[PDB]
Amino acid sequence: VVGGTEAQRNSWPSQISLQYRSGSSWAHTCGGTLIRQNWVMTAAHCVDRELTFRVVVGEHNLNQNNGTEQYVGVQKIVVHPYWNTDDVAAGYDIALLRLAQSVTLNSYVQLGVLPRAGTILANNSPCYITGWGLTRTNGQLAQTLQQAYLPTVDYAICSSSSYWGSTVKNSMVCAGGDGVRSGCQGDSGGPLHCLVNGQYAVHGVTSFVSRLGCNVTRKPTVFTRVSAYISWINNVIASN
C-alpha cells in the first residue's frame, strides 16, 4: 500500500496473508479475505504458480510474533474457469482456497461481509485498501498491515480515455488514482473494504495497477468486483 497508515490490529479481522514456501521459510506474496471458517477469497493470479501455499490469519506484523496468528495449509485451489493468465485485463481474477482446517474466530479473526449480487457503488464511495504490499513503487513490503483511504471511481469515468480506457471492464471496481495512494505489489488478492449502510463490506479483490508504477495520477488501482461473482462463489462453496 503506497501512502497508507498503519492499521489498528483489530480493525480488519478478515484480512489474511497468503504465503508460499521459499527454501526453509515462508514469504508473503498476496492478501486474501476469510469468507468462511475454511475458505479464503483471493486473486487467481496469486495462485498461478506451482508453489506450496499457506494462509495466516490474525496477522499484524509479518516479522514478529503478535500472539494472535493461526497458520493453516491450503487443501484445494479453485480458480475462476474463465481466468486466463496471459490476459489479466480480461477480468475473472478471483480464486477460492479451501483451507486444511477451519480457523477459530475471535477479535482478530472474523469473516468478511460480501455485498449482495450486482451491487454497484456510487462514484466516490468511501473505501479502504489494506495489505502488506510495497510501500513505494519498486520499494519493499511493509512489516505491519497498512491501510489507505481510496474512494471509488465509477465505471464511466474509469473507462474514459484519460483513465484506464478499454482496459477496465464492468466486472471491475476502480478506486484511488490521486497519485499518492494506491495498492502495490504484495497487496493483490486482498480486500477493498467499502462502507455501505453503516457496515464495511468487501467489494473488491485487488488485481492490478499501471505499468508506469503503483501510485499514478488517473490510474486508479483496479479490483475484481466481488458482487459480479456471488453466484459463482456460493456455487463453489456449496459443492466443495
Partner: peptide, 4 residues
C-alpha cells in the same frame, strides 16, 4: 497492466 501490472498484476500486484
Amino acid at each position: 497492466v501490472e498484476p500486484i
